[PDB]
Ligand binder design. Structure first.
Ligand SMILES: Nc1ncnc2c1ncn2[C@@H]1O[C@H](COP(=O)(O)OP(=O)(O)O)[C@@H](O)[C@H]1O
Ligand SMILES: Nc1ncnc2c1ncn2[C@@H]1O[C@H](COP(=O)(O)OP(=O)(O)O)[C@@H](O)[C@H]1O
Ligand SMILES: Nc1ncnc2c1ncn2[C@@H]1O[C@H](COP(=O)(O)OP(=O)(O)O)[C@@H](O)[C@H]1O
Ligand SMILES: Nc1ncnc2c1ncn2[C@@H]1O[C@H](COP(=O)(O)OP(=O)(O)O)[C@@H](O)[C@H]1O
Ligand SMILES: Nc1ncnc2c1ncn2[C@@H]1O[C@H](COP(=O)(O)OP(=O)(O)O)[C@@H](O)[C@H]1O
Ligand SMILES: Nc1ncnc2c1ncn2[C@@H]1O[C@H](COP(=O)(O)OP(=O)(O)O)[C@@H](O)[C@H]1O
Ligand SMILES: Nc1ncnc2c1ncn2[C@@H]1O[C@H](COP(=O)(O)OP(=O)(O)O)[C@@H](O)[C@H]1O
Ligand SMILES: Nc1ncnc2c1ncn2[C@@H]1O[C@H](COP(=O)(O)OP(=O)(O)O)[C@@H](O)[C@H]1O
Ligand SMILES: Nc1ncnc2c1ncn2[C@@H]1O[C@H](COP(=O)(O)OP(=O)(O)O)[C@@H](O)[C@H]1O
Ligand SMILES: Nc1ncnc2c1ncn2[C@@H]1O[C@H](COP(=O)(O)OP(=O)(O)O)[C@@H](O)[C@H]1O
Ligand SMILES: Nc1ncnc2c1ncn2[C@@H]1O[C@H](COP(=O)(O)OP(=O)(O)O)[C@@H](O)[C@H]1O
Ligand SMILES: Nc1ncnc2c1ncn2[C@@H]1O[C@H](COP(=O)(O)OP(=O)(O)O)[C@@H](O)[C@H]1O
Lengths: 73, 173, 173, 73, 173, 73, 173, 73, 173, 73, 173, 73, 173, 73
């Protein structure tokens, strides 16, 4: 109920971890950003924190889209 | 020679393991009996940064529910009739290395909690009193039951789920 | 920016908080989980005269019922095997400020009493012996259960109810 | 069982607190006085002590009636 | 103005009090909670010869059973870890006056005895050792339970019953 | 089992106390003497000692009968 | 007038007492509560050669088990915090006369022994050290429990039994 | 297990005491001697010592038989 | 004279026994009631290297299922109201010799496990705690029921089957 | 599902035990080797371990064939 | 005067009783209700060597099947909520004498066994634990049902039959 | 199925008891010995043990035949 | 007449005593209570070279564990409140003769040691300080407990065992 | 772990004592020497010292074998 938070938060996280695991990950793609906004996030902020540490590690290029995310969300 | 991974979904799961390499967040492995869970933990750890470090695997079913909260962590002297020394811990033995808790669902609510506290704080105390030990152990839970379900049954702490649910691998039969 | 209050019943409750400002009588907050109880305590105290003073919030459920009467108040040395110093208290740490006891219903009859004694006298002793400390702490109880009921169940001291029931705020789901 | 006490006591209290919290509260209105007499007062003298400290603080003008009281009683 | 007695059975009980005036034999008062027991003790003493003398009323329930035999009588130094001075006594404070023990049934067998000894001898010692103090205190026991019963339950010393059962007043609900 | 003792003892006591509390009480009436003999006296000599100190104090005239006694026995 | 003995078994027991007259061997009396034990001791002694001599009767139950071994015998100075003088003894007070220990079964193993030693040697010492006093006291034990039994329970020293079991009288209810 | 001792010992004792309490007791009768030999004597020599001091005192004539003994043994 | 074996299948089974001589692996004997099972165990042991050593045969049915796990192994003091000494064991009595458990199917799941652990490790502990005793006992199980079946009924641990199923003899009715 | 293991393993075992019980048993015959490969081995490696300790003891000559094996498998 | 026996078959049975005199082997009496079974037991015992010894006759039907195994034998303390003392036994009361169990068929399988054990060993224990008492009681069972039958119904232990079936008397209607 | 045992065993027993109850019983007669051999002995050795203790007690002379036995067998 | 020895094992033990004659090495005697231990010591000494010399037998149980190390050896003045003279010793009284310590297992670890030192050196000091006395006493220990066991319990010094275990005699019940 | 010491040591001891108690004991027999070598000697040199002083005293002839030794070892 704060879809206006998912994309900013997520982006926070993607930054934390991208720096924590030294990964050249800059950010999410549109396709991905959508998904993140549609997911119900039962865990809420917590679950997104995990979903993205996980997506940062699984990340291969500079961005994240339906690819790594769908694996979870 | 080598080990065995060749099916797509596993051709995959191996990599997921490889990527997770440089990490330490707990990992939750789930698949039917025999699918290779405990084989993946072992591989995750062979691949983590702490491969050379110990691997403390302990079946949570291989110990009466009333003595798990006495051997996982440790024990502060004279709190239970007969104590030769405050009891060390698999957590302490696994300090610096991996702690593969097999069959998680079989954790008492009391320890499910007590683990959570150590997954976040990393500090623990043997029985009543306070923490006086420093343990750096990467949690690796594997269970063959469906965690989520157990959460609606109240047999499994949810917050402990998401905590171990950082990285989640599911081995298909 | 700011915080959030806009519905009539809350447009209200905020004011009730504002009025209560210049007071110190304990306050009893009650609403379903998540309704904003602990958010009101915090606001009551941000508004009380002692806002700049500490806020000692402690979940009465976040501590085994047998050690609450050891940490809320304090502890007189050698009365329980192992005591590094007579134990201070959340009451003592909350001295001069607010003491927000969350989930009151979860108070042992023994402490329910022991609190009452400190809500009236304001003096307390750590275990057996007598009071030797001076604490000025405003009580702020919040519970999600229905107090009254608990009174007919005998799980909750009545006189302790009316004592905290000076000011009573009820947060609607 | 001392309805002849409620109104005098209450009036005691309203005085204590009106002076304790420096509130320009002089006393209860008829409408209010009635209520106070009808309430069962399980807590008795104690409950009335609280009900009124509370009503003194909640007080806005110089008097108290059904308004603040109903909030409780 | 005055106090309140007008029903026959009480129109009575008042007089019984008045007659008992010139006496000092202990008195046993019994009636349901609230009936006016402690109001009669107080009146008995306002009427006894020692009205101007003190009235030491002490609820036997308002003190943990393990510290009653430490506060009623008194305490001889260093017999229990920590003693600032051999502890005085409510018996000693009540010396020369009345000692209204409320809720007698709640007396430990150990004190039930220890009282008896002081109701007959009038001398007492604080802990182990011997009597070195002189106390002249009129016993006034009040309980809401049925003494006799308790005697067949063994929870109440019989000889202590008859000793306090010199004068017996029963307040009807 | 010594009904031949109740009336003499009792009479002892009634004397002790009548003198102890300066009461013009001379003795028990027939009606009273009967009762004293019928009571089971579980406390025995002790209980009679009390029953009569008590009856001496409660005494109003020069004698004691069913009146004061029934109060107890 | 006189005392009361008329039933055969007692018409008897009186004589047994009379014969025992010229003796001093301890005597063991046993019968249910109230049967007349302590009445026989008293009579035995009125009849013994030492009738004019003292009668030191002491209920072994009328003294906390931890202070019996301090009052029966006596006490050597400074051995227990606070000693106004090495404590005399009921044994010493009973010197030259009878010492009727009532309710024997209630003797601590420690004193059961300590008595035995004084029934044979007749010499005793107050606490640690050696005997320095001469006591000539005829032992008269009376108990309502069945001694023999207690012997298989280990609560009663056997050799102390036979020692007091020189002359044994049993009062029938 | 020394029935050959009971009768001699006993006889020792009966002598000691008969002289200790100045009693004209010469010895046991057959009937008595039997009993003494049948008793199990758990206390052994000790118990017999007592049983006979006791029998010497209880003695009325010059001899002891089932009479005084049965009282004990 | 001698014993009796002459039918082919038994002319056989005797030899199988003879060969097994030089061994110690457990043996599983099965045949209808009366067929000679317990007669073979006895013969196996008369023939094993430890013939001169004891033969501790115990009917698993001749003991209430709740006390088998107390007598087979042993018992650590004060763990069950009343313990005269930590209880020895048929395992300990059978140490160095044979332990013929008759009617195996009648083993509780708890002991079925506890046996397995001692068939492999050879070490055991009496109740909660750890192993502190060394036992060298050759297991000889005999049952008249069909083991395999019981395995699909879950009444019989499989791994314990194969463990005792090293050498298996089947006596034909 | 590792029939390529049965014959090597078996051969391991036959060696262990042949040495453990001092038996002049060198190995399995063809006829025997077949059987071992056809058996389903529910117990798997474990069951074969037993089946052969057992066959080593039951062994009479230098080899093992349908003979001892059939007894079990 | 005398008792009544005059028909041939009984003119007989009396003698059988007379011969059995010098014996102690249990006896099994069987006849329709009223035939004189319990009259024969009584006579057997009047004639046995232990006639002067007690006769403990107890109807096995005159006690709820769940309390027979508590009163026949005895009871070890605190094993069933509420125990004033480990319960004695009719076996213990019948020690040295006869124990006429009437209506045997009405014995629970559990006691049928427990009796057998005491008919052979003669030793028994009150509940869980071990035998610590010595009883010499001659068993005398009488039943009106046909034992044998009950054996094929499984309601009656066979081995217990032959054990009591040492001497068997059958009273014809 | 050991009729060669009945007569020897029986004879054992008849000896035990004949000595246990001091009975002048020497042994079974032919007529009796037959019966004992024909009985099925379901109880077997046990039942014969009883049948004969019983027959020893019931015995009147020096021998046992169809007489006492038939009573049972 | 004479003493009693006729069974083989004792027909023996007597001789063993006779041979040991010409010796002085300590001797360890062990047998159940009553078996004749203390009768053998006495005989060993009647036979040793020092028969005419004293026999100082002392029950180690017949003295409170805290005063044994004060009476066996001796005591140096003013070391324990009250000393009439530095206390002699049973060792000193037994000088030149035998010292039969009965019930050895009952020796405090402190004396078990202190004895050892005197079994080897033969010199001893009364309390703190140094040896100034010369004692020639042959040690003769007898105990009914199993020494070896006690050694694994740590209640009995091993080296003290082997020291007394020079000559070891075991009396069979 | 010095079986090469037992027989020499033992022999030392047997000499000491044989001379200390004036016993004509020359030495151990084969049968005996074996035993001494098999015993575990927990006490080690000490225990052997005792075992032999003891065996020297118990000695009857000129030698020591299974006889005296078994008494202990
Ligand atoms: N509003 C937020 N912005 C950024 N991170 C957040 C926010 N809320 C929570 N988190 C992160 O999510 C996790 C959830 O934390 P927490 O506050 O404990 O949740 P809860 O509401 O259950 O108390 C934290 O570890 C934190 O780092
Ligand atoms: N992917 C695999 N490649 C090779 N061997 C495997 C693989 N997965 C499982 N195994 C084997 O199967 C067995 C079952 O292993 P395990 O993973 O521990 O079971 P579970 O998954 O129930 O914990 C192991 O002994 C292992 O050698
Ligand atoms: N009225 C409100 N306005 C803004 N946020 C609120 C309000 N009420 C609750 N919250 C938020 O909801 C969460 C639940 O808070 P809390 O009051 O502590 O729960 P509970 O009432 O059960 O104690 C808080 O983290 C807080 O930020
Ligand atoms: N009669 C009264 N008049 C004025 N105030 C009163 C009266 N009775 C009680 N109160 C007030 O009400 C509270 C109730 O007090 P208390 O006497 O302790 O009640 P209780 O009857 O339960 O002992 C007190 O704090 C007091 O200030
Ligand atoms: N007879 C009476 N007349 C006037 N007031 C009374 C009377 N009896 C009781 N009360 C009042 O009722 C209250 C209850 O008093 P109390 O006697 O102390 O209770 P309890 O009998 O249980 O000890 C008191 O505060 C007192 O003022
Ligand atoms: N026979 C008696 N004659 C006169 N007064 C007696 C008699 N017996 C007892 N009393 C009185 O009764 C009370 C009972 O006393 P006590 O002798 O102690 O009784 P008990 O038999 O229980 O020891 C005493 O205080 C005493 O004054
Ligand atoms: N045989 C008796 N004749 C007269 N009075 C007796 C007799 N026996 C007991 N009594 C009386 O009974 C009371 C109980 O006495 P006591 O012998 O002391 O009790 P116990 O036997 O338990 O020690 C005494 O006060 C005494 O006067
Ligand atoms: N092969 C046999 N030869 C001789 N006697 C045997 C043989 N088999 C069984 N028996 C006898 O049969 C009885 C039944 O024995 P047992 O083997 O113990 O029964 P189960 O096989 O049910 O355990 C034994 O007492 C024994 O003497
Ligand atoms: N691959 C193998 N090669 C040789 N022996 C084996 C092999 N696997 C198992 N065994 C033997 O078989 C037995 C089965 O052992 P285990 O590893 O415990 O089986 P599981 O897979 O059930 O854990 C072991 O005692 C071992 O000696
Ligand atoms: N043979 C008999 N002679 C005289 N009276 C008998 C005889 N048999 C039974 N009775 C009487 O019949 C009644 C029934 O007795 P009982 O034997 O106890 O019944 P049951 O045989 O069912 O146990 C008894 O009271 C007894 O007096
Ligand atoms: N072969 C025998 N020879 C002599 N007496 C025997 C023989 N067998 C059994 N008995 C007797 O018969 C009874 C039956 O005994 P038991 O061995 O227990 O039978 P089971 O075969 O049922 O175990 C025993 O009390 C014993 O004295
Ligand atoms: N072999 C024996 N011959 C004769 N009397 C013996 C013999 N053994 C023991 N006794 C006697 O038995 C009693 C028990 O003696 P003792 O040896 O002192 O007991 P323990 O062996 O427990 O020390 C002694 O009084 C003694 O006379």
């Amino acid at each position: 109920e704060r879809k206006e938070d998912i994309i900013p938060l997520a982006n926070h996280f993607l930054k934390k971890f991208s720096r924590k695991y030294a990964k050249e990950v800059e950010g999410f793609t549109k396709s991905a950003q959508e998904l993140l906004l549609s997911y119900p996030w039962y865990g809420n902020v917590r679950e997104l924190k995990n979903v993205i540490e996980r997506a940062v590690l699984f990340s291969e290029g500079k961005f994240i889209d339906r690819g790594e995310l769908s694996c979870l969300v | 020679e080598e080990y065995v991974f060749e099916s797509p979904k596993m051709k995959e799961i191996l990599e997921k393991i490889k990527k997770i390499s440089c990490a330490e967040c707990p990992v939750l492995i789930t698949g039917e009996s025999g699918v290779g869970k405990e084989v993946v933990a072992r591989l995750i750890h062979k691949l983590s940064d702490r491969s050379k470090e110990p691997f403390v695997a302990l079946n949570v079913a291989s110990i009466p529910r009333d003595i798990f909260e006495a051997e996982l962590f440790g024990y502060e002297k004279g709190a239970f009739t007969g104590a030769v020394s405050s009891k060390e811990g698999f957590f302490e033995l696994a300090d610096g290395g991996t702690l593969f808790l097999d069959e998680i669902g079989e954790l008492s609510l009391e320890a499910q909690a007590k683990l959570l506290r150590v997954i976040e704080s990393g500090k623990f105390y043997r029985l009543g009193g306070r923490k006086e030990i420093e343990v750096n152990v990467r949690i690796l839970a594997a269970t063959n039951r469906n965690i989520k379900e157990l959460v609606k049954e109240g047999k499994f702490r949810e917050d402990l789920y998401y905590r171990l649910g950082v990285i989640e691998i599911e081995i298909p039969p």
